[model samples]
Target chain A: ESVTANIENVKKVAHHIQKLTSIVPEIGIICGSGLGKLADGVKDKITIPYTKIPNFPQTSHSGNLIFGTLSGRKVVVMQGRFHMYEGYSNDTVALPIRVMKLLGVKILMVSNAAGGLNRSLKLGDFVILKDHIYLPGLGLNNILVGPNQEAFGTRFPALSNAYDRDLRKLAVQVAEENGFGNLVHQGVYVMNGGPCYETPAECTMLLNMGCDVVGMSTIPEVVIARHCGIQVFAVSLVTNISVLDVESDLKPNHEEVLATGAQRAELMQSWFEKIIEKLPKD
Target chain B: ESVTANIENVKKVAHHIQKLTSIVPEIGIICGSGLGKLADGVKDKITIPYTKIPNFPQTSVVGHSGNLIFGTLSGRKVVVMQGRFHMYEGYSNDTVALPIRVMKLLGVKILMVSNAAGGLNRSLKLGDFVILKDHIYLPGLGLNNILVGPNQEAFGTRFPALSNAYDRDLRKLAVQVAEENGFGNLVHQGVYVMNGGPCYETPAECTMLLNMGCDVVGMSTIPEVVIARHCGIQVFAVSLVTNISVLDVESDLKPNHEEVLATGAQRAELMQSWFEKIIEKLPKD
Candidate 1:
C-alpha cells in the first residue's frame, strides 16, 4: 500500500529517521546524477538505506540517506532521488521533502543533469536555475495535486521566488573565487517528466517558451520543498545541447549525460561545499 | 485486478458492446462539453451506459451522461461518446486508451472530436471555431502521453509520428463546408496546445503558450487524438474558442468553467451541422 505524504505520516517517517541518526539536519542536499560524489565528502556520515525506513519511497538505484556534517554544518543527503517518470506516485515524491522539513531542514540545495536549450550554452556548463517552467505542473501532474497538507503549505504556493536569489549570488561568487566562474550561467530551467529524451520539435518548442535547460527531475522536489517553507537553491549541469533540427544526425544518449556528469562532478561538489560554508549563520 | 487495455482486454470490451448494439460504426465521434447534444440527433440510436459495459472507464463529471450512442448520421453509421475521460480527472492512461481502442475494434476509420478552449491567439474571438492544424501535447511531451506504456502491437506502432495525425483532406473539407454553410468567417486553422488543465492558464503561462505558437489551449482532446492516430484512425478535431485567454496576470478578467460551457452551448449547433456536412461529403468507400 502507498502512503500519502500528509503531515501525520510525514512526522512518523521523520521520527523514525531521528531515532536512526544522531544528526539533526538543517541543510538538505539532493544529489542529482552528476553530484552523487558530494555525499562522499560528508564527515562522520551515518548512511540509512531507503528500505530501512518505513513508508519511504524505495528505489534500487544507489538510494541512501546519508546524515552527517558537510562544511561544518549538520546535513542530510539523498544519494539518489525519486523521479516522476519512474512511475512513482506524487505522494511518493513529496514524502522525502516533507520528512526533510520535519527533520529541521531549513534550506534545500539540489543539482541535476539537463539538455542545454539556449543557443548560448555549451555542454559541461553549470546553469543556476533562476526560474523554471514546470511543464508537468502546468499540465496538472503537479506534486501538490491532492488534498492540502496544511501543516506544510498553503493551497496555492506562489513560485515567484522559488529559486532563492541570495543563494544564487553566493554560488556565483564561490565559482568566481574558485576560478570556475566562466563555467557558470544563470537561466530558466524547464522540467520534462521523462524516461525518454525530448524530440527535436519538443526541444525547439521548449526553447521558444524561454527555457534554457530541460531535465526530468528537480522541479518536483523543488515544489515540495518550497511548499513546506524550505528555501531552495538549484543548479543544472548542461550535459548535452538539445538538437532543435529534426534532420540533425546528433542525438542525446545516457552515456554522454553520465560522462558530462563525471567531468563536472568535482567542481560542482566543491561549489556546494563552499556555498554551504558561506550560508548565513543563525 | 484492473485489466490493462492491451489487445485481449480491448477485444473483450468490443465483443461485449457488439452483443448489445447492432450498428457497426464506420466513424467515431467524441463529444466535448457543449457538443453532447449531437448524440441525441443520431437516427435510430441505441444508448449503452458506460456502466453496462464491463471494464469501461466512467466519467466523474456531474452533467455528462457517460453513454455510448450508436446510430446513423448523414446516412453514415457512427458511434458517439457522450463523455470523455480527461487526464486532469486523474484517469490512468489505460482508462483513456480502452474506449478509442474499442472504437477501432468496432470498425471506426475516422475519429472526430471537439472541445471548448481558451483562445491564446489574439485574433481568435469567443465562439470562433479553430480547426486544429497541429497540437503541442504539453503533457505528452513531459512523459504523460496516453501511449507511455506497453504498445499493444495489435493496435499500433511504438513510435508513431504525429506528422499527419490530423488529416489534411478532412480539414480542407471542414473548411469548405464551413464556407459553404456561411460560418467560414468564424473558422480558422491554428495550432492547439493541450494545457492538461482543470485550472485555467495563468497570464504568464498564457503569454508563454502564445509565444510558443499555440492559438488555443484546452485540457483534453490531445490524448484521444494520439490514441486514435496510433490505431490508424484518421483524425479530425476542432476547438470552440470558449474564452479569450487574458494574457495579463494583473487584469481583472478570469476564465471560469461556467463561461466555457456557455460559449460551447452557443456554438454547439453550428458545430453539429458542420460535422454532419463533412460526413456527407466523405468519400463513400
Candidate 2:
C-alpha cells in the first residue's frame, strides 16, 4: 500500500532521462523550498518536466530536472523536491534522486530551510550539518522502513559517517571566502515529520535535545543517498528560530517557511555556485 | 487508503455487543502484556471472543482480546478488552485505537489500559506499575498519527492538545486507592515514551529516550489513549516495568517478551486488585 519505488521502478525513469541528456552527471543538487533561481546559471541546459519522465508522479512542481554544466561541471538540479508532508510516500521522494544516481550521479548536494534550535543562531544563518538525529527515523516512520531492495543499496545502512566531512569543510571555507563567513555555523539537525507546523511543546522538547536546526525533509534524501552509496553534503538555512518556551503564544506557519526560503535564496545561490566552481570534479 | 475505523465501522461491533449482553458497560478496559488475568475479577463474566466480533482481527499473542467481555467489577458495568492491538502487529494507529472508539460508541465514558514497558527511570524496578502522567508518542507525532486521514468528525478534533492528554485527577485517585490497599509502594507516577516496536529499543535509543525526559517506554496504550481522548473519554493508563532496560553495551542484557510475561505473572494479582479497588473508588456515572 505504500507508494514507494523499487530499483526497477526508477530504472525506467533513468532510461528515459539517459536518452535525453548527453551529460553523464557526476553531481546531483537538490534545491529545496524554491531554490529554483540557482538553475539560471546552467549552460547547455535541457529542461525535463517531471511528467515527461516515466514513473515520475504528477507534482505541482516547476521543480523539473535540469541537466546542465554549471561552473564547468555537469550536474542535475532538482528545481523542486518532494516532501513527506506533501502526501507522497518516501519512495516518491527517493525516485528522482535515485534516477539521478542511476544516470551516473556520484555525489548529492542538498539544501533546506529550517527552524534554528540553537538560541545563538540568527534567521539568515546557514548551518552546515555536521551530524543528524532523525527523530522520525528512530520512531520507525523512517523513509527506509520497508524491505531491502538489494539492487539499490545495502540491507542496513550505517549512518555514522553519512555526511561527507571534507565537503562540509570545503563549503564552509567557500562561504568564508565569499564574505558570508559570519553567517556560517556547523550544527546537528533533527528531522520531524510534519504536514502541520510543530507546536511550541514540540519545539521546546527538541531544543533541549541538542538539535541546532529542525525540519521535515533532509533525513529521507540523505538516508537514500547513503543507502545507494553516494557522498553527501547539506546546509540548513536558519529560516526561523524555534520558539523555546512551551507556553509561548507564537506559532509556526507554512507561509513563513515559504517566505524565508525565498528570502535566503540569492545568498545560497551565490554560495553554491562558488562551491560548485571549487567542488572537486570527480 | 487509510485502514482506520470510523463511527459506522465501530457501531456494527457495538451492535453485536449490545445483542450479546444485557450489560451496557460504562467503562472499557484494554488488557496488554500479562494483564490478561485482570479479567478474572469480573463477577458473572461472559466472554465474547474477538473472532465472533465484527471487523476485529484475530490475535496471535497472549496480549490479545479473545472477547468483548461483559461483567460487574466493583459494582460498575464494565467491558474488558482482553486483547489490545499493537503497531508492530502491522496495524495502523487508527486500527490500534479503533476498539477504544468502539467502546465509546457502546456507552463507555472511561478507558483503563495496562501495558508492559521497559523502565527508563532508574528509580523503577521490574514488576513496578507506573501510572502514566504524560507521554512522548514519537509515532503519533510523526507519520503514524491516528487522526491522519478523513477525521472521525462524529468523534473528535483534528488538532487536539496533547499536553492535557493524561488525566491528572484520575492518577491521584488511583494512587489513593493503591495506597489504601497497601499497593502504594509498588505504584509510581511517571511519563511513558511510545516507540514503534516489535523489537525492544536499542541501547542508543534507550539513551535518547532517557535524555528526552522519558521515564518509561512502551508501544501500546498511547494510540488507544489518543483515540479515547478524542472521543472525550477519560483515560487511566498504567505501564508495568517488566524489565530494567540496559543502557550500556558492556551490560550484555536483553529484554524478551517471555521475561515481560513472567513479570506480569508475578505482579498479576497485585495489579488486578489495585485496579479493582480504584474501580470501587469511582463515583459511577
Candidate 3:
C-alpha cells in the first residue's frame, strides 16, 4: 500500500472520468503518430481533455484523449502519446494505462510507427506483435523495475502468453476480410530508447538478436498493461526499413515515418473499425 | 546558461583541487573492486576526499571516495579515483560523469582503468587481464547514457566514435609491461560489454553477449571511459576475469561480489605495476 501510493493517481482520474460519463470504457486504444483520427468515428462522445485529468502528464504535448462509443462498444483512446525518448519516466508512460484499468478497460489495443527489420517487410506494411525482444529489459531498464505493487501484479510476470491468442487470430481474420492480407503480417517486435534513430551497427546487433521489427514506444505500455491482466493487441505500421548495411546509401529518418504513416492513415482507420466490430459487445 | 551550468561546476572543482595540490597531474587511475589499495602505494600522496571536491558524487556508497591520491609512480605524476561510479547504482549520468570532465580541467591527459568482469571468451581464465579494445555498451544506448542531460560542447561530439576509444599504443605498452614483469601469459586483448547490473548475467544473457562478439562483461569502466575519450583523454582499460561465465543452464556456477573482491586483492600488485609502467612510457605531447 505504501509503495503504490502513486496508483491512487489512476483512481483519481478514473473517478473524474466516472463523473464525466456513465459509459464505462471496456476498451482502450492508443493511436500512432498521424493516426489519431481513428477517434473521428466515435458517436455521442463524452470527450474529456487530458489537461483536466488529475496527475495526467504531457497534456500540452499530446493530442486530447477521447471517450466515446464506436458501434455499440464503449472505448477510450489516446490520440497522441508519451515516450521515454521525450524524457518522461516510464512511470509517466504507464500512468494512463493504469487509469484505463481502473475505468473498467478490459482490453488494450496499441499502435506505433516502427523500423521494419523482417527481411520481407517493406514500407507501409502493418505487423501484429507475436512476441517482443525488449533491449531495455535485457539491459535492466525494464519498466516493471521497482517494487512489486501487488495491487498491480507480479514482479516477474510470465510473458509466454503476453499477447491474447484469440485476439491475434481475430485481428488477422479482420485484415483478410478487409482485403488487406498482402500488407498485414505477424512478427516479433523490439524496443530501444530513441530520441535518435538506430545506428547501422545497433540495427545489425538487434537483427542478430532475432528481432523482426524495432521501435521505441509500445513495449513499456504493453508491459504495464499485461501486468494488470488487461488483454493487449498491438500493431506496428512500418514507417521505414531500418538501415542495417553500413554501405547503404539510404538512412532512416523521422520524416519518412510520418510520410509512410500519412499514406496508410485511411486504410488503418478502416481496418481497426472492422477489428473493433469483431470485439464482444459490452 | 542555466542548463550548461554543470560543466562550469567541473571548472569550480578543478580550480579548488589545483589550489590544494600544485601538482598538474597528467594521468588518472580508477581502481576497481578491492583494488583501491593501489593508491596507498603512492609516494608523497595528498588524498582529497570526494566530499571536498565540488561536483564529485557518491562518496558514502563507495566508502568515502577512496579519495583523490596525487603522487609520483614510476617517475610520472597522477591522480587516482580509488573507487568508481556505476550505472546500476541509480546515479544520474551527469553525476557519474562529472569527474572525467574535472580531470580534463585538472590537466589529465591519459586515463587508466581496471574492473572485475565475467569472462565470455573461453580462452580467458580466472585472474587474466583482458585489455579493452572495443565495447558493446547496452546502457549507453539507453537513457542511462553519460552524455544525455546537457551538451558539453567543449568536451565532445554528438556521435563520439567509440571504436578508437582505447589508445592502441598504451595497450601495447601494457602488454610489454606485463612481459617485462613475467606476467605476459596472463594478458590478452578483448572486447567488452557493459550491462547495467549489480546481478551477474544469466546463462541466456551470457550466450547473447558471446554471440554479439563480447569477450568479457562488466558494469563499470565504459561510462567513465566514454566521458574520458569525449574530452580527448587517451584510455587504456583492463578487465580482470573474476569467474568463467556460465553458458550452460545446468552449470552450478554463481557470481559473488565478495569473490571478485578477494580476487581483486590477490591480483592488485601485478596490475598496479603494469599501469605504472604505462604512465612512464606514455607520450608527453
Best by lDDT: 1
lDDT of 2 by residue, B96-181 (tens): 76777778888888888899899999899898889999998888766677677778888888888776776888899999998887
For residue B143, give model 3's deviation from the true position in Å. 5.1
lDDT agreement of model 3 with the native: 0.78
lDDT digits (tens) for residues A1-282 of candidate 2: 433578777888888888887888988999875365888988899999887886786577445889999888889988777788878787787787788789988889889888888889988788988767677665666676555567887544545456677788899899888888999998878887776666777787777766788888888888788878899989998877788676677666667877887888888888888888897653
By TM-score, the better pick of 1 and 3 is 1
Q: Report, in order, each candidate's fnat.
A: 0.14, 0.09, 0.08
TM-score of candidate 1 on Cα atoms, chains taken together: 0.62
Across B1-285, the per-residue lDDT of candidate 3 in tens digits comes to: 111325578788788889899878888888784356667888789988877866567445324444788987777888888656666545667766788888888888998888889899999998999999888878766666777665678788877887689988888888888898888999999999986754456555676788889999887888899898888999989899987887754444567566777788888877777776767777873
Candidate lDDT values, in order: 0.87, 0.79, 0.78
Cα deviation of A174, candidate 1, in Å: 16
Query: Residues A70-176, candidate 3, lDDT per residue (tens digit)?
Result: 76788898876878887777677877888888888899988898988877998899988877766776575867654445677653454445667678889899889
Interface RMSD score of each model: 4.9, 6.1, 6.5
Of candidates 2 and 1, the better by TM-score: 1
Candidate 2: the clashing residue pairs are A63-A79, A63-A80, B48-B67, B49-B66, B50-B66, B64-B83, B65-B83
Query: Which ranges of candidate 2 are over 4 A from the true structure?
Result: A1-3, A245-259, B1-137, B140-207, B213-285
User: Per-residue lDDT tens digits of candidate 1, residues B1-285?
Assistant: 146889999999999999998999999999985576687899999999998899988774455549999999999999999878777556788988999999999999999999988899999899999999999998887778888878888999999999988899999999999999898999999999987654466555777889888999888899999999999999999999988987653355667567777988877788888898899898755
Show where candidate 3 strays beyond 4 Å.
Answer: A1-134, A138-282, B1-7, B62-66, B142-144
- lDDT of model 1, residue A162: 69
